[PDB]
A = this chain, B = another copy of it.
């Protein structure tokens, strides 16, 4: 049996107070009747508003990034600061941060390790580029990204880890991976985890797909045996996030 699914909303750098209040009310009014962990990741400045307004019992709130330690880091938000304000989920290593904001495999791995030490649930993002896929490097790439993370984790830390496989070429592009494309990668990841970390870890690990997930494509993705839910960007700013949650039934 699959582990508990996750439906995660990465709002990215988007929102107004008015738009968030409206969307949150839509999410609150959508009554969910199955076991699923829903996650909303707003911008940092919107975390208090979402904390005040989001009441659906299936949801938790996540940050979109963090740094490990407080101190002289003008502009940044640390893991202790998030924990204190009641945020205990974080997305780390998103492709936009790997690509625009310098986050190498080592930097991502270090962040994930620190977040686990500080008691976070972590959605750790991995995925290959278009060029890497064309070169038949997908497996080497995602396994290298995963192994870099793993090397900084104890076995027991994996209870706090969620992997999100997002092919870079599928993020925001109108070009979702097919169910067969996604399942092939999730199967390889779970095999690596089973062999390197443990069979027990692998059976419990949520491996989410992201990159152009929408209400119409989600159910057929979820039907694949190694897909445990979704990391959703554009569609998570819309009412159709309700249908993506329901696609994890």
Contacts and interface: CB of A to CB of B under 8 A. Distances in A.
A172 interface: yes
Interface string A5-41: 0000010111111000000000000000000000000
Contacts of A102: 101-102
A75 B102 CA distance: 13
Nearest to A41: B74
Contact of A64 (B67, B75, B97): B75
A71 interface: yes
Given A44-B45, A45-B45, A85-B45, A74 B64 contact: yes
Copies of the chain in the assembly: 2
Interface stretch (A76-84, A151-159, A192-200, A219-227): A76-84
Residue in A12, A94, A172 whose Cβ sees the most chain B Cβ within 10 Å:
A12
Nearest to A91: B74
A102 B73 CA distance: 13
A132 interface: no
Nearest to A48: B48
Interface in A65-120: 65, 67, 70-78, 81-82, 84-85, 87, 91, 94, 96-97, 100-102
A46 interface: yes
A196 B36 CA distance: 61
5 contacts: A13-B76, A17-B84, A44-B44, A45-B48, A72-B96
A150 interface: no
A160 to B, nearest CB: 20
B16 A74 contact: no
A23 to B, nearest CB: 15
Interface in A96-149: 96-97, 100-102
Interface string A42-65: 011111110000000000000111
A233 interface: yes
Nearest to A13: B73
